[PDB]
């Protein structure tokens, strides 16, 4: 059960990015974003998670202000995990 202030699919932003909080239900292949190969990507490795926000599987994203992400997730804006 996803948290209160789960990004939903309704979302604008979540739609503008193709966000899905399963990245196996996601297009990360179709967008091919740099810096992994996109199989590998979800937002646990994605430079905007937040980890301390939230709690557990749900965490920040600093695109998605007041809300929460899936870990296992996936968005257009991923970006690796630098620093
Ligand atoms: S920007 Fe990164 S952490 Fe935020 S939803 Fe997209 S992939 Fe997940």
């Given at each position: ?29 179709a ?47 991923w ?5």
């Amino acid at each position: 059960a996803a948290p209160a202030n789960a990004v939903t699919a309704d979302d604008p932003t979540a739609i503008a990015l193709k966000y899905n909080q399963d990245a196996t239900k996601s297009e990360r292949v179709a967008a091919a974003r740099p810096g992994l190969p996109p199989e590998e990507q979800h937002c646990a490795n994605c430079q905007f998670m937040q980890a301390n926000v939230g709690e557990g599987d749900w965490k920040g994203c600093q695109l998605f202000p007041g809300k929460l992400i899936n870990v296992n997730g996936w968005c257009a804006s991923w970006t690796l995990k630098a620093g």
